[PDB]
Protein backbone atom coordinates (compact mmCIF):
# COMPACT_ATOMS: atom_id res chain seq x y z
CA UNK A 1 0.00 0.00 0.00
CA UNK A 2 3.15 2.11 -0.02
CA UNK A 3 5.61 2.63 -2.86
CA UNK A 4 8.96 0.83 -2.84
CA UNK A 5 10.67 4.17 -2.12
CA UNK A 6 7.77 5.96 -0.40
CA UNK A 7 8.68 5.32 3.24
CA UNK A 8 12.05 6.97 2.67
CA UNK A 9 10.22 10.31 2.25
CA UNK A 10 7.24 9.88 4.63
CA UNK A 11 8.50 12.28 7.28
CA UNK A 12 6.79 14.67 9.64
CA UNK A 13 6.72 18.39 9.01
CA UNK A 14 5.99 20.48 5.98
CA UNK A 15 2.49 21.34 7.19
CA UNK A 16 1.20 24.85 6.62
CA UNK A 17 -1.55 24.30 9.18
CA UNK A 18 -2.21 21.12 11.11
CA UNK A 19 0.93 20.38 13.08
CA UNK A 20 1.45 16.69 13.77
CA UNK A 21 -2.20 15.95 14.61
CA UNK A 22 -3.28 15.75 10.96
CA UNK A 23 0.24 15.02 9.67
CA UNK A 24 -0.17 11.39 8.65
CA UNK A 25 -1.16 9.17 5.74
CA UNK A 26 -4.29 7.11 5.18
CA UNK A 27 -3.26 4.57 2.59
CA UNK A 28 -1.59 6.45 -0.25
CA UNK A 29 -3.13 9.80 0.62
CA UNK A 30 -1.40 12.27 2.85
CA UNK A 31 -4.08 13.94 4.93
CA UNK A 32 -3.09 17.11 6.72
CA UNK A 33 -5.62 19.56 8.11
CA UNK A 34 -6.21 20.83 4.59
CA UNK A 35 -6.91 17.27 3.51
CA UNK A 36 -9.46 17.04 6.31
CA UNK A 37 -11.08 20.31 5.21
CA UNK A 38 -10.93 19.30 1.54
CA UNK A 39 -12.74 16.05 2.32
CA UNK A 40 -15.23 18.00 4.42
CA UNK A 41 -15.99 20.51 1.67
CA UNK A 42 -16.02 17.86 -1.06
CA UNK A 43 -18.32 15.44 0.77
CA UNK A 44 -20.61 18.20 2.04
CA UNK A 45 -20.83 19.71 -1.44
CA UNK A 46 -21.61 16.32 -2.95
CA UNK A 47 -24.23 15.80 -0.25
CA UNK A 48 -25.75 19.14 -1.24
CA UNK A 49 -25.64 18.00 -4.87
CA UNK A 50 -27.49 14.88 -3.74
CA UNK A 51 -29.91 17.07 -1.81
CA UNK A 52 -30.67 18.97 -5.02
CA UNK A 53 -31.03 15.63 -6.80
CA UNK A 54 -33.53 14.62 -4.12
CA UNK A 55 -35.57 17.83 -4.11
CA UNK A 56 -35.51 18.15 -7.90
CA UNK A 57 -36.17 14.40 -8.27
CA UNK A 58 -33.21 14.37 -10.66
CA UNK A 59 -31.16 11.27 -9.94
CA UNK A 60 -29.05 11.59 -13.06
CA UNK A 61 -25.49 12.91 -13.03
CA UNK A 62 -26.24 14.32 -16.48
CA UNK A 63 -29.65 15.93 -15.88
CA UNK A 64 -28.96 17.13 -12.33
CA UNK A 65 -27.94 20.75 -11.84
CA UNK A 66 -27.50 23.10 -8.91
CA UNK A 67 -28.25 26.33 -10.56
CA UNK A 68 -27.43 29.71 -9.03
CA UNK A 69 -30.33 31.95 -7.95
CA UNK A 70 -32.32 34.01 -10.39
CA UNK A 71 -30.89 37.29 -11.64
CA UNK A 72 -33.52 39.23 -9.67
CA UNK A 73 -32.17 37.55 -6.52
CA UNK A 74 -28.96 39.56 -6.81
CA UNK A 75 -26.34 38.66 -4.23
CA UNK A 76 -28.94 37.67 -1.64
CA UNK A 77 -28.94 34.24 -0.06
CA UNK A 78 -31.37 32.17 -2.04
CA UNK A 79 -33.75 29.47 -0.88
CA UNK A 80 -32.08 26.09 -1.16
CA UNK A 81 -34.70 25.24 -3.79
CA UNK A 82 -34.05 28.55 -5.59
CA UNK A 83 -30.25 28.65 -5.86
CA UNK A 84 -29.27 28.42 -2.20
CA UNK A 85 -27.91 24.92 -2.73
CA UNK A 86 -25.75 26.31 -5.53
CA UNK A 87 -24.43 28.98 -3.14
CA UNK A 88 -23.62 26.37 -0.50
CA UNK A 89 -21.86 24.22 -3.09
CA UNK A 90 -19.99 27.27 -4.39
CA UNK A 91 -18.62 27.89 -0.91
CA UNK A 92 -17.89 24.16 -0.64
CA UNK A 93 -16.10 24.06 -3.99
CA UNK A 94 -14.00 27.13 -3.24
CA UNK A 95 -13.12 25.65 0.14
CA UNK A 96 -12.35 22.21 -1.28
CA UNK A 97 -10.18 23.59 -4.10
CA UNK A 98 -8.29 25.89 -1.72
CA UNK A 99 -7.87 23.07 0.81
CA UNK A 100 -6.67 20.72 -1.94
CA UNK A 101 -4.13 23.27 -3.15
CA UNK A 102 -2.96 23.89 0.42
CA UNK A 103 -2.63 20.15 1.03
CA UNK A 104 -0.50 20.08 -2.11
CA UNK A 105 1.58 22.91 -0.64
CA UNK A 106 2.02 20.74 2.45
CA UNK A 107 3.03 17.74 0.33
CA UNK A 108 5.47 19.90 -1.65
CA UNK A 109 7.03 21.16 1.58
CA UNK A 110 7.32 17.59 2.86
CA UNK A 111 9.00 16.48 -0.36
CA UNK A 112 11.22 19.53 -0.69
CA UNK A 113 9.88 20.30 -4.15
CA UNK A 114 8.72 23.68 -5.36
CA UNK A 115 5.13 24.83 -4.98
CA UNK A 116 4.57 24.91 -8.75
CA UNK A 117 1.84 22.26 -8.67
CA UNK A 118 -0.36 23.95 -6.03
CA UNK A 119 0.34 27.23 -7.84
CA UNK A 120 -0.98 25.87 -11.16
CA UNK A 121 -3.94 24.32 -9.37
CA UNK A 122 -4.46 27.72 -7.75
CA UNK A 123 -4.54 29.29 -11.19
CA UNK A 124 -7.38 26.90 -12.05
CA UNK A 125 -9.02 27.71 -8.70
CA UNK A 126 -8.62 31.39 -9.53
CA UNK A 127 -10.58 30.79 -12.70
CA UNK A 128 -13.33 29.11 -10.71
CA UNK A 129 -13.40 31.88 -8.09
CA UNK A 130 -13.39 34.74 -10.60
CA UNK A 131 -16.08 32.97 -12.62
CA UNK A 132 -18.33 32.35 -9.61
CA UNK A 133 -17.52 35.60 -7.79
CA UNK A 134 -16.05 38.01 -10.34
CA UNK A 135 -18.82 37.48 -12.88
CA UNK A 136 -21.57 37.94 -10.24
CA UNK A 137 -19.82 41.10 -8.98
CA UNK A 138 -19.49 42.45 -12.53
CA UNK A 139 -23.07 41.61 -13.51
CA UNK A 140 -24.77 42.13 -10.15
CA UNK A 141 -25.80 38.71 -8.91
CA UNK A 142 -25.00 35.06 -8.27
CA UNK A 143 -27.32 34.17 -11.17
CA UNK A 144 -24.62 35.12 -13.68
CA UNK A 145 -22.28 32.40 -12.41
CA UNK A 146 -22.34 28.98 -14.01
CA UNK A 147 -24.35 26.19 -12.35
CA UNK A 148 -23.18 22.83 -11.04
CA UNK A 149 -24.39 20.18 -13.44
CA UNK A 150 -22.34 17.76 -15.53
CA UNK A 151 -24.35 18.60 -18.66
CA UNK A 152 -26.26 21.68 -17.50
CA UNK A 153 -23.18 23.83 -17.02
CA UNK A 154 -22.54 23.03 -20.69
CA UNK A 155 -25.98 24.52 -21.38
CA UNK A 156 -24.96 27.59 -19.39
CA UNK A 157 -21.76 27.83 -21.42
CA UNK A 158 -23.86 27.52 -24.58
CA UNK A 159 -26.33 30.22 -23.56
CA UNK A 160 -23.72 32.64 -22.20
CA UNK A 161 -21.71 32.21 -25.39
CA UNK A 162 -24.75 32.75 -27.60
CA UNK A 163 -25.70 35.81 -25.54
CA UNK A 164 -22.92 37.43 -27.58
CA UNK A 165 -24.27 35.86 -30.77
CA UNK A 166 -21.12 34.07 -31.98
CA UNK A 167 -18.89 33.28 -29.01
CA UNK A 168 -16.15 31.78 -31.18
CA UNK A 169 -15.21 35.26 -32.28
CA UNK A 170 -14.53 36.45 -28.69
CA UNK A 171 -10.91 37.56 -28.54
CA UNK A 172 -10.34 35.82 -25.22
CA UNK A 173 -12.10 32.75 -26.57
CA UNK A 174 -9.96 32.82 -29.71
CA UNK A 175 -6.78 33.17 -27.67
CA UNK A 176 -7.86 30.55 -25.13
CA UNK A 177 -8.97 28.01 -27.71
CA UNK A 178 -5.63 28.53 -29.42
CA UNK A 179 -4.00 28.00 -26.02
CA UNK A 180 -5.94 24.80 -25.27
CA UNK A 181 -5.16 23.48 -28.74
CA UNK A 182 -1.50 24.45 -28.27
CA UNK A 183 -1.53 22.76 -24.86
CA UNK A 184 -2.90 19.50 -26.25
CA UNK A 185 -0.55 19.86 -29.23
CA UNK A 186 2.45 20.37 -26.95
CA UNK A 187 1.39 17.58 -24.58
CA UNK A 188 1.11 15.25 -27.58
CA UNK A 189 4.51 16.41 -28.85
CA UNK A 190 6.13 16.12 -25.44
CA UNK A 191 4.70 12.75 -24.48
CA UNK A 192 5.55 11.51 -27.95
CA UNK A 193 9.11 12.82 -27.72
CA UNK A 194 9.79 11.33 -24.30
CA UNK A 195 8.28 7.99 -25.29
CA UNK A 196 10.15 8.07 -28.61
CA UNK A 197 13.44 8.63 -26.80
CA UNK A 198 12.75 5.93 -24.22
CA UNK A 199 10.78 3.58 -26.51
CA UNK A 200 12.53 3.37 -29.89
CA UNK A 201 12.03 0.34 -32.11
CA UNK A 202 12.73 -2.97 -30.42
CA UNK A 203 16.46 -3.60 -30.36
CA UNK A 204 17.37 0.09 -30.34
CA UNK A 205 19.01 1.69 -27.33
CA UNK A 206 17.37 4.44 -25.31
CA UNK A 207 18.22 7.79 -26.85
CA UNK A 208 19.40 10.94 -25.10
CA UNK A 209 18.56 14.62 -24.71
CA UNK A 210 20.81 15.31 -27.68
CA UNK A 211 18.60 12.98 -29.73
CA UNK A 212 15.38 14.77 -28.81
CA UNK A 213 16.97 18.20 -29.31
CA UNK A 214 18.20 17.27 -32.78
CA UNK A 215 14.84 15.65 -33.47
CA UNK A 216 12.92 18.87 -33.06
CA UNK A 217 15.73 20.88 -34.65
CA UNK A 218 15.53 18.65 -37.73
CA UNK A 219 11.74 18.62 -37.51
CA UNK A 220 10.75 22.26 -37.02
CA UNK A 221 14.10 24.04 -36.72
CA UNK A 222 13.78 24.67 -33.00
CA UNK A 223 14.04 22.46 -29.94
CA UNK A 224 12.84 23.99 -26.69
CA UNK A 225 14.64 21.39 -24.57
CA UNK A 226 13.89 19.41 -21.43
CA UNK A 227 13.43 22.40 -19.14
CA UNK A 228 11.86 24.52 -21.87
CA UNK A 229 9.11 22.05 -22.73
CA UNK A 230 7.89 21.86 -19.13
CA UNK A 231 8.15 25.63 -18.67
CA UNK A 232 6.24 26.14 -21.92
CA UNK A 233 3.66 23.56 -20.88
CA UNK A 234 3.00 25.09 -17.50
CA UNK A 235 2.86 28.46 -19.28
CA UNK A 236 0.46 27.24 -21.98
CA UNK A 237 -1.98 25.61 -19.59
CA UNK A 238 -1.81 28.44 -17.06
CA UNK A 239 -2.22 31.04 -19.81
CA UNK A 240 -5.24 29.18 -21.12
CA UNK A 241 -6.75 29.34 -17.63
CA UNK A 242 -6.07 33.10 -17.49
CA UNK A 243 -7.63 33.38 -20.94
CA UNK A 244 -10.63 31.53 -19.51
CA UNK A 245 -10.76 34.08 -16.68
CA UNK A 246 -10.75 36.94 -19.17
CA UNK A 247 -13.32 35.27 -21.40
CA UNK A 248 -15.79 34.50 -18.63
CA UNK A 249 -15.28 37.94 -17.09
CA UNK A 250 -15.64 39.90 -20.34
CA UNK A 251 -18.53 38.21 -22.18
CA UNK A 252 -21.45 40.25 -20.93
CA UNK A 253 -19.69 42.48 -18.38
CA UNK A 254 -17.44 44.10 -20.98
CA UNK A 255 -19.27 43.36 -24.23
CA UNK A 256 -23.04 42.88 -24.41
CA UNK A 257 -23.16 42.86 -28.21
CA UNK A 258 -21.96 40.07 -30.46
CA UNK A 259 -18.28 39.24 -30.47
CA UNK A 260 -18.53 39.40 -34.28
CA UNK A 261 -19.61 43.00 -33.75
CA UNK A 262 -16.73 43.42 -31.30
CA UNK A 263 -14.31 42.37 -34.03
CA UNK A 264 -16.06 44.63 -36.52
CA UNK A 265 -15.85 47.51 -34.04
CA UNK A 266 -12.07 47.84 -34.16
CA UNK A 267 -10.30 45.52 -36.61
CA UNK A 268 -11.86 46.72 -39.92
CA UNK A 269 -11.54 50.34 -38.74
CA UNK A 270 -7.82 50.10 -37.97
CA UNK A 271 -6.69 53.14 -39.97
CA UNK A 272 -3.83 51.33 -41.71
CA UNK A 273 -6.47 49.47 -43.74
CA UNK A 274 -9.72 51.42 -43.17
CA UNK A 275 -9.73 53.46 -46.37
Amino acid sequence: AMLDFERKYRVRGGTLLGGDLFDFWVGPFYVGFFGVTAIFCAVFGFLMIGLKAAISETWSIFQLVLAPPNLENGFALAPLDEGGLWQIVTACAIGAFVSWALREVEISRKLGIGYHIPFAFGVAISFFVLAQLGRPLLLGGWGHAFPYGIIAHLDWVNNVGYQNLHYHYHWAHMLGCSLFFATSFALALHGGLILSVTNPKKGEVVKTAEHENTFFRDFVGYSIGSLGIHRLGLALALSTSISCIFGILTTGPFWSRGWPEWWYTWWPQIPIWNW
Binding site: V65, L66, A67, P68, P69, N70, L71, E72, E82, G83, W86, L138, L139, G140, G143, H144, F146, P147, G149, A152, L154, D155, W156, V157, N158, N159, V160, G161, Y162, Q163, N164, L165, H166, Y169, G252, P253, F254, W255, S256, R257, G258, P260, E261, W263, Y264, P268
Partner: protein, 346 residues
Protein backbone atom coordinates in the same frame (compact mmCIF):
# COMPACT_ATOMS: atom_id res chain seq x y z
CA UNK B 1 -15.12 47.74 -24.82
CA UNK B 2 -18.34 47.82 -22.81
CA UNK B 3 -19.00 48.20 -19.13
CA UNK B 4 -21.35 47.24 -16.29
CA UNK B 5 -24.05 47.82 -15.18
CA UNK B 6 -26.47 46.29 -17.68
CA UNK B 7 -30.22 46.06 -17.92
CA UNK B 8 -30.65 42.31 -17.48
CA UNK B 9 -33.63 40.26 -18.63
CA UNK B 10 -33.65 36.63 -17.51
CA UNK B 11 -35.32 34.97 -20.50
CA UNK B 12 -35.03 31.40 -19.20
CA UNK B 13 -34.51 29.21 -16.15
CA UNK B 14 -31.90 30.24 -13.63
CA UNK B 15 -28.36 29.03 -14.20
CA UNK B 16 -29.12 28.13 -17.82
CA UNK B 17 -27.38 31.28 -19.04
CA UNK B 18 -30.65 32.32 -20.70
CA UNK B 19 -30.63 36.05 -20.16
CA UNK B 20 -30.07 39.20 -22.18
CA UNK B 21 -27.76 42.03 -21.14
CA UNK B 22 -28.55 45.42 -22.67
CA UNK B 23 -26.16 48.32 -22.21
CA UNK B 24 -28.04 51.28 -20.66
CA UNK B 25 -25.44 53.78 -21.88
CA UNK B 26 -25.72 52.47 -25.44
CA UNK B 27 -29.52 52.75 -25.37
CA UNK B 28 -29.10 56.27 -23.97
CA UNK B 29 -26.73 57.13 -26.83
CA UNK B 30 -29.26 55.74 -29.34
CA UNK B 31 -32.16 57.52 -27.63
CA UNK B 32 -32.47 60.02 -30.48
CA UNK B 33 -32.63 57.11 -32.94
CA UNK B 34 -34.97 54.94 -30.86
CA UNK B 35 -37.68 57.48 -29.94
CA UNK B 36 -40.50 58.53 -32.23
CA UNK B 37 -41.28 62.25 -32.50
CA UNK B 38 -43.96 63.70 -30.27
CA UNK B 39 -47.31 62.83 -31.81
CA UNK B 40 -49.56 65.49 -33.26
CA UNK B 41 -52.91 65.99 -31.48
CA UNK B 42 -55.66 63.61 -32.53
CA UNK B 43 -57.62 64.74 -35.59
CA UNK B 44 -61.41 64.59 -35.78
CA UNK B 45 -63.06 62.06 -38.08
CA UNK B 46 -65.95 64.47 -38.75
CA UNK B 47 -65.58 66.62 -41.84
CA UNK B 48 -65.32 66.46 -45.60
CA UNK B 49 -63.46 63.44 -46.93
CA UNK B 50 -59.93 64.07 -48.17
CA UNK B 51 -60.88 62.45 -51.48
CA UNK B 52 -63.49 65.17 -52.01
CA UNK B 53 -61.45 68.31 -51.22
CA UNK B 54 -58.38 67.05 -53.09
CA UNK B 55 -58.07 65.98 -56.72
CA UNK B 56 -55.62 63.07 -56.57
CA UNK B 57 -56.35 61.32 -53.27
CA UNK B 58 -57.04 57.59 -53.44
CA UNK B 59 -55.39 55.75 -50.54
CA UNK B 60 -56.40 58.39 -47.97
CA UNK B 61 -59.78 59.08 -49.58
CA UNK B 62 -61.80 57.70 -46.64
CA UNK B 63 -60.01 60.08 -44.24
CA UNK B 64 -61.41 63.32 -42.95
CA UNK B 65 -59.69 66.50 -44.08
CA UNK B 66 -58.24 67.09 -40.61
CA UNK B 67 -57.05 63.48 -40.30
CA UNK B 68 -55.61 63.78 -43.81
CA UNK B 69 -53.62 66.89 -42.91
CA UNK B 70 -52.47 65.34 -39.63
CA UNK B 71 -51.18 62.23 -41.36
CA UNK B 72 -49.60 64.25 -44.18
CA UNK B 73 -47.70 66.39 -41.68
CA UNK B 74 -46.64 63.30 -39.74
CA UNK B 75 -45.46 61.56 -42.92
CA UNK B 76 -43.46 64.68 -43.77
CA UNK B 77 -41.93 64.53 -40.30
CA UNK B 78 -41.25 60.79 -40.70
CA UNK B 79 -40.04 60.21 -44.27
CA UNK B 80 -39.45 63.58 -45.89
CA UNK B 81 -36.45 64.50 -43.77
CA UNK B 82 -35.19 67.98 -44.59
CA UNK B 83 -36.85 68.04 -48.03
CA UNK B 84 -40.32 68.55 -46.58
CA UNK B 85 -43.36 68.56 -48.84
CA UNK B 86 -41.22 68.75 -52.00
CA UNK B 87 -39.78 65.32 -51.17
CA UNK B 88 -42.85 63.65 -52.69
CA UNK B 89 -44.52 66.65 -54.35
CA UNK B 90 -43.82 68.74 -57.41
CA UNK B 91 -45.31 72.23 -57.77
CA UNK B 92 -48.61 70.47 -58.50
CA UNK B 93 -49.74 68.66 -55.35
CA UNK B 94 -52.00 66.23 -57.25
CA UNK B 95 -49.29 65.01 -59.66
CA UNK B 96 -47.30 61.81 -59.09
CA UNK B 97 -44.24 62.88 -61.09
CA UNK B 98 -41.85 61.92 -58.30
CA UNK B 99 -41.59 58.20 -57.62
CA UNK B 100 -41.61 59.10 -53.93
CA UNK B 101 -45.27 60.14 -54.25
CA UNK B 102 -46.48 56.80 -55.62
CA UNK B 103 -44.09 54.81 -53.43
CA UNK B 104 -45.47 56.65 -50.40
CA UNK B 105 -48.98 55.82 -51.59
CA UNK B 106 -48.05 52.13 -51.59
CA UNK B 107 -46.30 52.72 -48.25
CA UNK B 108 -49.48 54.10 -46.70
CA UNK B 109 -51.26 51.01 -48.02
CA UNK B 110 -48.53 48.78 -46.54
CA UNK B 111 -48.58 50.53 -43.16
CA UNK B 112 -52.37 50.18 -43.05
CA UNK B 113 -52.02 46.49 -43.92
CA UNK B 114 -49.37 45.94 -41.25
CA UNK B 115 -51.36 47.70 -38.54
CA UNK B 116 -54.53 45.82 -39.51
CA UNK B 117 -53.13 42.32 -39.99
CA UNK B 118 -49.75 41.96 -38.27
CA UNK B 119 -50.75 43.65 -35.01
CA UNK B 120 -52.36 40.56 -33.47
CA UNK B 121 -49.30 38.34 -34.03
CA UNK B 122 -46.29 40.61 -34.18
CA UNK B 123 -46.84 44.37 -33.96
CA UNK B 124 -48.52 44.45 -30.53
CA UNK B 125 -46.48 41.92 -28.57
CA UNK B 126 -45.74 44.15 -25.57
CA UNK B 127 -47.64 47.35 -26.38
CA UNK B 128 -50.39 48.28 -28.79
CA UNK B 129 -47.58 49.76 -30.86
CA UNK B 130 -48.10 48.91 -34.49
CA UNK B 131 -45.92 50.66 -37.03
CA UNK B 132 -45.84 54.14 -38.51
CA UNK B 133 -43.73 55.66 -41.25
CA UNK B 134 -41.16 56.55 -38.58
CA UNK B 135 -40.81 52.94 -37.41
CA UNK B 136 -38.59 52.16 -40.41
CA UNK B 137 -37.69 55.56 -41.87
CA UNK B 138 -36.81 57.28 -38.57
CA UNK B 139 -37.30 60.70 -40.13
CA UNK B 140 -35.38 59.91 -43.30
CA UNK B 141 -36.36 59.08 -46.90
CA UNK B 142 -34.37 55.83 -46.73
CA UNK B 143 -34.88 53.72 -43.60
CA UNK B 144 -31.39 53.56 -42.08
CA UNK B 145 -31.70 49.80 -41.57
CA UNK B 146 -33.26 49.07 -44.95
CA UNK B 147 -31.29 46.38 -46.75
CA UNK B 148 -30.49 45.62 -50.37
CA UNK B 149 -29.46 42.37 -51.97
CA UNK B 150 -25.73 41.96 -51.51
CA UNK B 151 -23.52 43.01 -54.41
CA UNK B 152 -22.54 39.38 -54.92
CA UNK B 153 -25.90 37.71 -55.58
CA UNK B 154 -26.48 39.99 -58.57
CA UNK B 155 -22.98 40.01 -60.03
CA UNK B 156 -21.94 37.73 -62.84
CA UNK B 157 -20.10 34.80 -61.28
CA UNK B 158 -16.64 33.90 -62.56
CA UNK B 159 -17.23 30.21 -62.04
CA UNK B 160 -13.70 29.03 -62.91
CA UNK B 161 -11.88 32.05 -61.46
CA UNK B 162 -10.84 33.00 -57.94
CA UNK B 163 -12.28 34.88 -55.00
CA UNK B 164 -15.92 33.82 -54.73
CA UNK B 165 -16.98 33.94 -51.09
CA UNK B 166 -20.39 32.37 -51.91
CA UNK B 167 -22.20 35.26 -50.19
CA UNK B 168 -20.27 34.47 -47.00
CA UNK B 169 -16.92 35.29 -45.45
CA UNK B 170 -17.26 39.06 -45.52
CA UNK B 171 -18.09 41.82 -43.07
CA UNK B 172 -21.80 42.60 -43.08
CA UNK B 173 -24.26 43.94 -40.54
CA UNK B 174 -26.76 41.67 -42.31
CA UNK B 175 -25.13 38.73 -40.51
CA UNK B 176 -24.22 40.64 -37.32
CA UNK B 177 -20.64 40.83 -38.65
CA UNK B 178 -20.22 37.06 -38.83
CA UNK B 179 -18.82 35.16 -41.81
CA UNK B 180 -22.24 33.54 -42.25
CA UNK B 181 -24.14 33.82 -45.56
CA UNK B 182 -24.96 37.45 -46.34
CA UNK B 183 -27.91 36.58 -48.61
CA UNK B 184 -29.88 35.11 -45.71
CA UNK B 185 -32.14 38.17 -45.75
CA UNK B 186 -33.02 37.36 -49.36
CA UNK B 187 -33.40 33.67 -48.51
CA UNK B 188 -35.80 34.12 -45.59
CA UNK B 189 -37.16 37.68 -45.43
CA UNK B 190 -37.85 37.70 -49.18
CA UNK B 191 -37.71 34.09 -50.30
CA UNK B 192 -40.02 31.47 -48.85
CA UNK B 193 -38.24 28.23 -49.79
CA UNK B 194 -35.62 28.77 -47.08
CA UNK B 195 -35.75 26.42 -44.11
CA UNK B 196 -35.10 27.99 -40.71
CA UNK B 197 -35.74 24.75 -38.78
CA UNK B 198 -32.21 23.55 -39.47
CA UNK B 199 -31.58 21.63 -36.25
CA UNK B 200 -31.66 17.91 -36.87
CA UNK B 201 -34.44 15.84 -35.40
CA UNK B 202 -34.18 12.32 -36.80
CA UNK B 203 -35.83 9.61 -34.76
CA UNK B 204 -34.35 9.15 -31.33
CA UNK B 205 -31.85 11.78 -32.41
CA UNK B 206 -30.65 9.42 -35.14
CA UNK B 207 -30.33 9.71 -38.91
CA UNK B 208 -33.03 7.13 -39.52
CA UNK B 209 -33.58 5.78 -43.03
CA UNK B 210 -36.54 8.17 -43.30
CA UNK B 211 -34.62 11.10 -41.78
CA UNK B 212 -33.98 13.96 -44.19
CA UNK B 213 -32.50 17.17 -42.85
CA UNK B 214 -31.12 20.37 -44.27
CA UNK B 215 -27.63 20.72 -45.66
CA UNK B 216 -24.89 22.35 -43.63
CA UNK B 217 -25.14 25.34 -45.98
CA UNK B 218 -28.82 25.71 -45.10
CA UNK B 219 -27.71 25.68 -41.47
CA UNK B 220 -25.21 28.42 -42.32
CA UNK B 221 -27.92 30.54 -43.94
CA UNK B 222 -30.37 30.05 -41.08
CA UNK B 223 -27.73 30.86 -38.46
CA UNK B 224 -26.84 33.96 -40.47
CA UNK B 225 -30.47 35.05 -40.45
CA UNK B 226 -30.55 34.36 -36.71
CA UNK B 227 -27.43 36.51 -36.33
CA UNK B 228 -29.36 39.23 -38.14
CA UNK B 229 -32.29 38.74 -35.76
CA UNK B 230 -30.04 39.05 -32.72
CA UNK B 231 -28.31 42.09 -34.21
CA UNK B 232 -31.63 43.75 -34.98
CA UNK B 233 -33.08 43.24 -31.52
CA UNK B 234 -29.77 44.08 -29.77
CA UNK B 235 -30.06 40.81 -27.84
CA UNK B 236 -28.31 37.47 -27.95
CA UNK B 237 -29.67 34.12 -29.01
CA UNK B 238 -31.01 33.63 -25.46
CA UNK B 239 -33.71 36.23 -26.12
CA UNK B 240 -35.66 33.66 -27.96
CA UNK B 241 -33.97 30.37 -27.19
CA UNK B 242 -32.36 27.95 -24.87
CA UNK B 243 -29.56 27.56 -27.41
CA UNK B 244 -29.06 24.13 -26.19
CA UNK B 245 -32.27 23.22 -27.81
CA UNK B 246 -33.11 25.55 -30.66
CA UNK B 247 -35.77 23.25 -32.14
CA UNK B 248 -37.56 23.15 -28.75
CA UNK B 249 -40.25 25.82 -28.82
CA UNK B 250 -41.46 24.82 -25.35
CA UNK B 251 -38.01 25.76 -24.02
CA UNK B 252 -37.92 29.07 -25.91
CA UNK B 253 -39.07 32.45 -24.57
CA UNK B 254 -42.28 33.87 -25.98
CA UNK B 255 -40.31 36.38 -28.07
CA UNK B 256 -39.45 33.52 -30.42
CA UNK B 257 -43.09 33.10 -31.44
CA UNK B 258 -43.54 36.77 -32.31
CA UNK B 259 -40.11 36.69 -33.97
CA UNK B 260 -41.47 33.89 -36.14
CA UNK B 261 -44.28 36.16 -37.30
CA UNK B 262 -41.79 38.96 -37.82
CA UNK B 263 -39.91 36.70 -40.21
CA UNK B 264 -43.08 36.03 -42.17
CA UNK B 265 -44.11 39.65 -41.83
CA UNK B 266 -40.81 40.76 -43.32
CA UNK B 267 -41.42 38.31 -46.14
CA UNK B 268 -44.89 39.78 -46.55
CA UNK B 269 -43.49 43.30 -46.53
CA UNK B 270 -40.80 42.38 -49.01
CA UNK B 271 -42.88 40.24 -51.35
CA UNK B 272 -46.21 42.07 -51.53
CA UNK B 273 -45.14 45.64 -50.79
CA UNK B 274 -41.42 46.38 -51.24
CA UNK B 275 -40.38 44.38 -54.30
CA UNK B 276 -43.41 45.35 -56.47
CA UNK B 277 -42.25 48.95 -55.97
CA UNK B 278 -39.40 48.37 -58.44
CA UNK B 279 -41.80 49.31 -61.25
CA UNK B 280 -42.44 52.69 -59.63
CA UNK B 281 -38.74 53.51 -59.28
CA UNK B 282 -36.71 55.02 -62.13
CA UNK B 283 -34.59 52.49 -63.99
CA UNK B 284 -31.26 54.09 -63.01
CA UNK B 285 -32.27 55.52 -59.63
CA UNK B 286 -29.39 56.07 -57.22
CA UNK B 287 -31.63 54.89 -54.37
CA UNK B 288 -31.75 51.39 -55.87
CA UNK B 289 -29.27 48.83 -54.62
CA UNK B 290 -26.24 47.52 -56.49
CA UNK B 291 -28.37 44.73 -57.97
CA UNK B 292 -30.93 47.35 -59.04
CA UNK B 293 -33.26 46.41 -56.19
CA UNK B 294 -35.42 48.47 -53.87
CA UNK B 295 -34.30 48.45 -50.26
CA UNK B 296 -36.13 45.66 -48.46
CA UNK B 297 -37.41 45.48 -44.90
CA UNK B 298 -35.56 43.26 -42.44
CA UNK B 299 -35.79 42.78 -38.70
CA UNK B 300 -33.41 45.71 -38.26
CA UNK B 301 -35.57 48.01 -40.41
CA UNK B 302 -38.03 48.37 -37.52
CA UNK B 303 -35.73 46.99 -34.79
CA UNK B 304 -32.94 49.51 -35.30
CA UNK B 305 -30.82 47.65 -32.74
CA UNK B 306 -33.80 47.77 -30.39
CA UNK B 307 -35.90 45.05 -28.78
CA UNK B 308 -39.12 46.85 -29.66
CA UNK B 309 -39.29 49.61 -32.29
CA UNK B 310 -39.49 53.18 -31.00
CA UNK B 311 -39.43 51.90 -27.40
CA UNK B 312 -42.75 50.20 -28.04
CA UNK B 313 -44.54 53.51 -28.47
CA UNK B 314 -48.23 52.94 -29.17
CA UNK B 315 -49.39 54.07 -32.61
CA UNK B 316 -52.49 51.97 -33.34
CA UNK B 317 -54.81 54.22 -31.35
CA UNK B 318 -52.50 57.21 -31.87
CA UNK B 319 -52.64 56.98 -35.70
CA UNK B 320 -55.89 55.26 -36.69
CA UNK B 321 -55.43 56.61 -40.21
CA UNK B 322 -52.34 54.39 -40.54
CA UNK B 323 -54.41 51.37 -39.44
CA UNK B 324 -56.36 49.75 -42.25
CA UNK B 325 -59.08 47.12 -42.31
CA UNK B 326 -58.04 43.53 -41.54
CA UNK B 327 -57.46 41.40 -44.62
CA UNK B 328 -60.36 38.91 -44.81
CA UNK B 329 -58.06 36.12 -46.05
CA UNK B 330 -55.04 37.00 -43.92
CA UNK B 331 -53.18 33.94 -42.65
CA UNK B 332 -49.65 34.09 -41.26
CA UNK B 333 -49.11 30.49 -42.44
CA UNK B 334 -49.61 31.51 -46.10
CA UNK B 335 -46.22 33.23 -46.38
CA UNK B 336 -44.15 30.17 -47.28
CA UNK B 337 -45.00 27.80 -44.41
CA UNK B 338 -48.39 26.20 -45.05
CA UNK B 339 -48.47 27.69 -48.54
CA UNK B 340 -47.64 30.73 -50.63
CA UNK B 341 -51.20 31.99 -51.10
CA UNK B 342 -50.60 35.39 -49.50
CA UNK B 343 -47.23 36.02 -51.20
CA UNK B 344 -48.48 37.64 -54.39
CA UNK B 345 -46.47 36.87 -57.51
CA UNK B 346 -44.84 33.75 -56.05
Amino acid sequence: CERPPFEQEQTGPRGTGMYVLDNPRILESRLDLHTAPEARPMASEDGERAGDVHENVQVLADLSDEQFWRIKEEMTDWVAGDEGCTYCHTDDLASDEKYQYRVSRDMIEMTRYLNANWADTHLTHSNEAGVTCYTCHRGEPIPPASWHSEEESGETRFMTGMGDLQLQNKISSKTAYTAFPRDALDTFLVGHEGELSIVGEGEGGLRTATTEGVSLREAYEAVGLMMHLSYSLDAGCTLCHNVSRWASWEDSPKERETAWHGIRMARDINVNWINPLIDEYPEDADVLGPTGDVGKVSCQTCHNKERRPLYGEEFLELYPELVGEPDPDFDYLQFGDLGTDLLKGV
